[PDB]
Ligand binder design. Structure first.
Ligand SMILES: *O[C@H]1[C@@H](OC)[C@H](n2cnc3c(=O)[nH]c(N)nc32)O[C@@H]1COP(=O)(O)OP(=O)(O)OP(=O)(O)OC[C@H]1O[C@@H]([n+]2cn(C)c3c(=O)[nH]c(N)nc32)[C@H](O)[C@@H]1O
Lengths: 88, 126, 741
RNA sequence: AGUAGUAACAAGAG
RNA sequence: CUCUGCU
């Protein structure tokens, strides 16, 4: 019994993002729970990376591209590349 | 266009597929759609990236031309689809099957007459 | 001196002047009142042609059902629905043999279509019966209602977006012991909930709605047509897809091709028959429709054809293809509005719904309706008549023409095993069959063999209105062939005149119709000029857009006169603004805005082509610069027109008669749905151009897009600190509203 | 009355 | 007294 441990040892919204993403990709999250744990930890670390760090003279310095649906993630990437000119 | 004499002849029109919109031959339908997404909805492109040099050049010129265009993006996208994507149609014809001649088919070829007409402008080398 | 137009045929051959034999200038015959009588007549007639079949009672719906399959062989020339399973299977087997791999390749193509087909495909189509409301609704509306009901019932397997998943939900719904729906009753608005038992929902899922075909030309008596429910259409789409894939691979099947594609295919095939026929062989061509074709095409035979076609395919594919014939074999036909009873002595009217004909006394009816009610009473169940046999206005046109072409291919010399042989063209109930035989006796023998074989398969040739002549001239689906198809302009006359889309779309459509008729239907140039003049006059009168210089008085005359005085270049004015008509044979293909662009006044050009004008409204790309046109004969056509979107591209008022009916709530819901969708486009401009994707709610996508757009705009400097702060705070407020609910 | 034709209109719903 | 003129 590990999935309950993942549920109880993570932020509710982080696990929500993990499960919604997986369900988007069409995987049964009750069997391959190792990928579930890996995705959850990766999202968590990304949030910490973008946590408490702000750009100001308050605004988030780091935009978390992961954890959002594919079209929205690519929309974010395209908008950033079109405004700043960074290569897509 | 140049209008020559009209000749009354026993016209025999055969039904065959012709092109009404030649499209941008170098770019297939999918490439045209990708270019349209780039030009009209750059942010909503997604993961697609333009590779064919023809795509890059036409996307560039169109973006430069479409600068500060208040026209609805949907209309611009539809007009670009018409301009770029090739479209064919089965039509009874008697002369050239190129678009420059099909669009004036009503004017040129008739039941008993042929109107010798030469559409103006450049003609595709193919 | 008695002038007689028909005597013109003494010199001009009938085909060359066939246009004169079309009264299409006059109004088509419409149907007044209810269609319940026509539906009852159709049900009784269909059950009469199969009376010698086997009677059973369905164990699920409880309604009596009639099976004419493998019934007694016909003993007379009257139409008969006793199709033989062995004969149809044999015809399909020989079709497969003569066209190796047709079934396999078609099945794989259908497999890929089934894989890649989404639920949104069902939005296409019109007047789809909505089981939730017991009335005809637009296909999209009926689909949305069915999806909502399924979601409320736990059928939450359709969010994948795939049509096959929706079909799985459809079966799961039928297997449910009970159902819940939402209906509005006004007595004040009440959103009541109705509970349907298993049998009632089953009956209302197989129910087929019926109405009377209006504006139908060439028939003295009106006929009843039917439209299916939402459950049926899903499987019907796949069945038709497979049948159409099969048809495209058949030389004799001209149904999938249309218009000039249809004419070219038919011309080529008839030419091939005339070519491969031996010189010494006597050749004849038969023109004919099939009497009671729809009433006799039993759905059990369609099930047999599908099962044969899906041989060796995956069992799930066989299921997906075979479900539709199963449901149709157990289909039910709604009667309709009902009847209207009058009392002259007391001078009052009343409308009796068709649901209460199974109990009403028979003294209220006239003789004909009296006997129709008496004959149909056994089949009446819950306001619907069981119609297991036949195909009441079936949509299996593709499958039916597959069967017809299979029988048609049965005429090859390797199959006839005789001197005579036959081929031809099949399309729905119409056929043109060419018989080649050494002598007239051979021609007659071949004709008899083909007719008897058709009787065996269930196809009944109409001897009443079919005739045979020497090969070279014939008729097929209102196409008259006289050694080569001849143009019949009278068919396209109703298309002329004001279409009624809007001022710009209607000018573009009128000029395009004239141009297309010149190209196709042999519309001479002088007659083209006539048509242009008459269309412009009709357009001006309809749109009250006479030239400003004219003295004609109309409620729009003052504004047009003021505009006429205002403009410096009169020629640049559009015809909708009192400008002159510059059209001619030269420029029928040029939109008026582009034609008069160089002549337009600068200010007038800006006002007319102002993108911020409130008149222009743009829906999804699929409904841009296109219109639906109904020809005198045939189904609806999607006509695309070239028009520059100007202030004249407005929308006409929408019928508000639903405002004073119990079902206004649907209209309100539509309003709100649009209110949401337009905002989604405000956040995702490409939603209109191409359908958006995602699983998250609309609010989540919009708020995330707003946040990211705010950050990018700030970085580019398009917005200041205060604007970004307000946007972020509003987004947080939206989040709190969603959370609290 | 009359339109019209196999069933309706000759207003309908509050 | 209000609503509708293809619902
Ligand atoms: O549209 C037609 C043709 O123009 C009408 C067009 N086309 C030809 N050349 C060009 C061109 O340079 N640029 C453009 N834009 N378009 C061109 O393509 C179509 C040509 O095909 P079609 O006319 O339908 O038939 P055909 O000309 O016979 O084409 P195809 O059958 O493919 O054969 C092409 C040449 O091959 C020769 N050839 C074939 N084989 C097997 C042999 C061979 O074994 N030995 C020899 N000596 N030659 C062979 C054919 O004879 C033909 O010359």
């Amino acid at each position: 019994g590990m999935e309950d441990f993942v549920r109880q040892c993570f932020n509710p919204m982080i696990v929500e993002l993990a499960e919604k993403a997986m369900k988007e990709y069409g995987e049964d999250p009750k069997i391959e729970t190792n990928k579930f744990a890996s995705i959850c930890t990766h999202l968590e670390v990304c949030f910490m990376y973008s946590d408490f760090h702000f750009i100001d003279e308050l605004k988030h310095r780091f935009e978390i591209i992961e954890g959002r649906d594919r079209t929205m993630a690519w929309t974010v990437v395209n908008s950033i590349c079109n405004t700043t000119g960074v290569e897509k | 266009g140049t209008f020559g004499p009209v000749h009354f002849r026993n016209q025999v029109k055969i039904r065959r597929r012709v092109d009404i919109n030649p499209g941008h031959a170098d770019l297939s339908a999918k490439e045209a759609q990708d270019v349209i997404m780039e030009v009209v909805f750059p942010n909503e492109v997604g993961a697609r990236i333009l590779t064919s040099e023809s795509q890059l050049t036409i996307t560039k010129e169109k973006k430069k031309e479409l600068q500060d265009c208040k026209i609805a993006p949907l209309m611009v996208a539809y007009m670009l689809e018409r301009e770029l994507v090739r479209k064919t149609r089965f039509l009874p014809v008697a002369g050239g099957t190129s678009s420059v001649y099909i669009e004036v088919l009503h004017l040129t070829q008739g039941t008993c007459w042929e109107q010798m007409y030469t559409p103006g402008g450049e003609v595709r080398n193919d | 001196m008695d002038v007689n137009p028909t005597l013109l045929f003494l010199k001009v051959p009938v085909q060359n002047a066939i246009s004169t034999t079309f009264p299409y200038t006059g109004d088509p015959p419409y149907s007044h009142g209810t269609g319940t009588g026509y539906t009852m007549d159709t049900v009784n007639r269909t059950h009469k042609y199969s009376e010698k079949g086997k009677w059973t009672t369905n164990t699920e719906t409880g309604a009596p059902q009639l099976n004419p399959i493998d019934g007694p062989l016909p003993e007379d020339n009257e139409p008969s629905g006793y199709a033989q399973t062995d004969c149809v299977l044999e015809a399909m087997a020989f079709l497969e043999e003569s066209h190796p791999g047709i079934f396999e390749n078609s099945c794989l193509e259908t497999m890929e279509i089934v894989q890649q087909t989404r639920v949104d495909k069902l939005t296409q189509g019109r007047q789809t019966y909505d089981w939730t409301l017991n009335r005809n609704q637009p296909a999209a509306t009926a689909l949305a209602n069915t999806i909502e009901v399924f979601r409320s019932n736990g059928l939450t397997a359709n969010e994948s977006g795939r049509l096959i998943d929706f079909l799985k939900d459809v079966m799961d719904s039928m297997d449910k012991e009970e159902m819940e729906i939402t209906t509005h009753f006004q007595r004040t608005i009440g959103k009541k909930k109705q509970r349907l038992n298993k049998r009632s929902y089953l009956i209302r899922a197989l129910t087929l709605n019926t109405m009377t075909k209006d504006a139908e030309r060439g028939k003295l008596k009106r006929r009843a047509i039917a439209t299916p429910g939402m459950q049926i259409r899903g499987f019907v789409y796949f069945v038709e897809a497979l049948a159409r894939s099969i048809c495209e691979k058949l030389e004799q099947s001209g149904l999938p091709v249309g218009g000039n594609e249809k004419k070219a295919k038919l011309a080529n095939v008839v030419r091939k028959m005339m070519t491969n026929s031996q010189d010494t062989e006597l050749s004849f061509t038969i023109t004919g429709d099939n009497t009671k074709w729809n009433e006799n095409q039993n759905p059990r035979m369609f099930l047999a054809m599908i099962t044969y076609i899906t041989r060796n395919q995956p069992e799930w594919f066989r299921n997906v293809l075979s479900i539709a014939p199963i449901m149709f074999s157990n289909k039910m036909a709604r009667l309709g509005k009902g009847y209207m009873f009058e009392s002259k002595s007391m001078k009052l009217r009343t409308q009796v719904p068709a649901e209460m004909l199974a109990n009403i006394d028979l003294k209220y009816f006239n003789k004909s309706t009296r006997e129709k009610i008496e004959k149909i009473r056994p089949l009446l169940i819950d306001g619907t008549a069981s119609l297991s046999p036949g195909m009441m206005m079936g949509m299996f046109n593709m499958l039916s023409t597959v069967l017809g072409v299979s029988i048609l291919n049965l005429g090859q010399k390797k199959y006839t095993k005789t001197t005579y042989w036959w081929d031809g063209l099949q399309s729905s109930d119409d056929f043109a069959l060419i018989v080649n035989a050494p002598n007239h006796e051979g021609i007659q023998a071949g004709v008899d063999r083909f007719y008897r074989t058709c009787k065996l398969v269930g196809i009944n040739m109409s001897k009443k209105k079919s005739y045979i002549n020497r090969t070279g001239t014939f008729e097929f689906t209102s196409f008259f062939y006289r050694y080569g198809f001849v143009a019949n302009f009278s068919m396209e006359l109703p298309s002329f005149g004001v279409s009624g889309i809007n001022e710009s779309a209607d000018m573009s459509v009128g000029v395009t119709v004239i141009k297309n008729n010149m190209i196709n239907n042999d519309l001479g140039p002088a007659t083209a000029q006539m048509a242009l003049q008459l269309f412009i006059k009709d357009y001006r009168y309809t749109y009250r857009c006479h030239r400003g210089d004219t003295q004609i008085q109309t409620r729009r005359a003052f504004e047009l006169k003021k505009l006429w005085e205002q403009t410096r270049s009169k020629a640049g004015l559009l015809v909708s603004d009192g400008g002159p008509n510059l059209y001619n044979i030269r420029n029928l293909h040029i939109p008026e805005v582009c034609l008069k662009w160089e002549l337009m006044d600068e200010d007038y050009q800006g006002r007319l082509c102002n993108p911020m004008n409130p008149f222009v409204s743009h829906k999804e790309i699929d409904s841009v610069n296109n219109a639906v046109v109904m020809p005198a004969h045939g189904p609806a056509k999607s006509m695309e027109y070239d028009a520059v979107a100007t202030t004249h591209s407005w929308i006409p008022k929408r019928n508000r008669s639903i405002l004073n009916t119990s079902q206004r709530g649907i209209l309100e819901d539509e309003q709100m749905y649009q209110k949401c969708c337009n905002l989604f486009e405000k956040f995702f401009p490409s939603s209109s151009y191409r359908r958006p994707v995602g699983i998250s709610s609309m609010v989540e996508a919009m708020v995330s897009r707003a946040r990211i757009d705010a950050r990018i705009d700030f970085e580019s400097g398009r917005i200041k600190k205060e604007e970004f702060a307000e946007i972020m705070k509003i987004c947080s407020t939206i989040e709190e509203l969603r959370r609290q609910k």
